[PDB]
Design a protein around this ligand. Structure first.
Ligand SMILES: *[C@@H](O)[C@H](C[C@@H]1CCNC1=O)NC(=O)[C@H](CC(C)C)NC(=O)OC[C@H]1CC[C@H](CCC)CC1
Ligand SMILES: *[C@@H](O)[C@H](C[C@@H]1CCNC1=O)NC(=O)[C@H](CC(C)C)NC(=O)OC[C@H]1CC[C@H](CCC)CC1
Lengths: 300, 300
């Protein structure tokens, strides 16, 4: 009774366009009279290993960017590069522009990805921005320019634009100002994300979700302290749990009648003992890509 | 690099309305000049255990159904009951009606759910129609009338409308002609689905997805036969694998260079030996809610 759920994608579907330079095609985001896309649309295959984007872009004029919205060509009347994104000014405001903002999301928070190819939406799924500033997505060639977002009220908060894949199979990208999350650069070389630490506060939120939904076998008669819990967290590359995290879990704690430090004692035992072939909310691993807010929103 | 992915929901978002009878509110699906909704909208709380729907509906007139599309009231000008759904004729065709059909989906196939409350979309996620004709969803009070669908071309194939929850926490509902999937009836009593068998062909498809995405530790030096594999399948409440299933897996077999019966030999060993703390595509359990088509569509 608890699922990984994406936001409804309609408001974002109406913003997706196709951008082509030469033989390179990817997706763009069309808001008001600007189309945002990854700057490596200007690269050929001989450019992708070590591109000099400033030099490559000087050779491009407005008419070298083909922007297609459905079957309709948009006229590009200006272009500029901002960090790792291009802004193509077009002669038509997108009539479907929703209320929106650009946000740079914090590690540990979640968002929905609308995967797109050739300017056409393909599917939607939820991701977390991991502590090492990667995401575990599903992206193929042609998917760059697909965006991540949250919806709050009628307002779309765009937080991610897709650019690349890492050797480990995870994904990296930018905010909508073109600044990468994490240490990555948009060149087609092997890059490291570092240790992929687990989002402790989210695992605890998901354990609360399990209790709400009737899965309680892992609850024990013990409690612990924050410092004692963190000694075990460290060994498993879990984020240190802070008092701020404990405060964020307060509402779930009161809803279930299970103190945060009692749930930490249960998590400690799960980390050290495993699940002994049992499952929690249909999973045999501890899930860390639901925030406390995600759990409350879903269970309400 | 492989995710549970729902279809983009925009085309369906535009069809969702709110239907109220008395104090009972749920969602309706507005296509052309008809609104489809679960018939238990006519029930009060004293009716839900053993409703006589024919007798309850005779007491209702067109003006007792309040249909709200956004902030706009629709005028109900006819009503009728078809199996477990009501069809409310309204005086306005939905201008956002997509190209659509109604399909009754086969067990083992997948679809996207647009979860809705008060006629407003809340989130989207993928489900399989399980062999015992239940789905593992996320639904609360107020969610009935939410629909499941596939998108093929520009055409929306509606296959599911949500009605109820079972004691085991799984979910049951109807096609858009109002006929339940499975043995269930729309009354608020404990009902059994029977043994929840695993969709063998889908597990094999997902193992092929894992190979495509670089996860190959479970491949062994053995092969097997269909009859020998099924002797082990039976013990684990797996669907018998048929030659028709083997044929459906043909394209994934050729894409990976792993014969179907070689992959069955790997699955056999996983079933008998477990995963020994290892994971496949980020899971510590064998996943059966991706069809062969889902895998091909995603990996393309
Ligand atoms: C969108 O244009 C595209 C999306 C990629 C393709 C495959 N999966 C994705 O998410 N992005 C790219 O092709 C970028 C473009 C450069 C200029 C940033 N290239 C990319 O993602 O490279 C993939 C790397 C994988 C790891 C490999 C080293 C392995 C030892 C090098 C390339
Ligand atoms: C939509 O109206 C609503 C959705 C339910 C509510 C909770 N989760 C859901 O999916 N459907 C209902 O309230 C139906 C209405 C009847 C008339 C079909 N009722 C329902 O789903 O009942 C839940 C059952 C759970 C198991 C319980 C027995 C446990 C020993 C009985 C009720």
């Amino acid at each position: 009774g608890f699922r990984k759920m994406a936001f409804p994608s309609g408001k974002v579907e109406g913003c997706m366009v196709q951008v082509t330079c030469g033989t390179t095609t990817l997706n763009g985001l069309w808001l008001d009279d600007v189309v945002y896309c990854p700057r490596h649309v200007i690269c050929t295959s001989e450019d992708m290993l070590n591109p000099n984007y400033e030099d490559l872009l000087i050779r491009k004029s407005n008419h070298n960017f083909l922007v297609q919205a459905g079957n309709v060509q948009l006229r590009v009347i200006g272009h500029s590069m901002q960090n790792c994104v291009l802004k193509l000014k077009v002669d038509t405001a997108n009539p479907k522009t929703p209320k929106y903002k650009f946000v740079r999301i914090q590690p540990g928070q979640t968002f929905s990805v609308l995967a797109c190819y050739n300017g056409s939406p393909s599917g939607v799924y939820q991701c977390a921005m991991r502590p090492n500033f990667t995401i575990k997505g599903s992206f193929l060639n042609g998917s760059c320019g697909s965006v991540g977002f949250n919806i709050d009220y009628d307002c779309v908060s765009f937080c991610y634009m897709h650019h690349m894949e890492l050797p480990t199979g995870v994904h990296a990208g930018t905010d909508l100002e073109g600044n990468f999350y994490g240490p990555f650069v948009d060149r087609q070389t092997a890059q490291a994300a570092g240790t992929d630490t687990t989002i402790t506060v989210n695992v605890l939120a998901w354990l609360y979700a399990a209790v709400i939904n009737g899965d309680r076998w892992f609850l024990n008669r013990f409690t612990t302290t924050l410092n004692d819990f963190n000694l075990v967290a460290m060994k498993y590359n879990y984020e240190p749990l802070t008092q701020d995290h404990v405060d964020i879990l307060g509402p779930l704690s009161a809803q279930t009648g299970i103190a945060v430090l009692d749930m930490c004692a249960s998590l400690k035992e799960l980390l050290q003992n495993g699940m002994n072939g049992r499952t929690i909310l249909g999973s045999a691993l501890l899930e860390d890509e639901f925030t406390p807010f995600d759990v409350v929103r879903q269970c309400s």
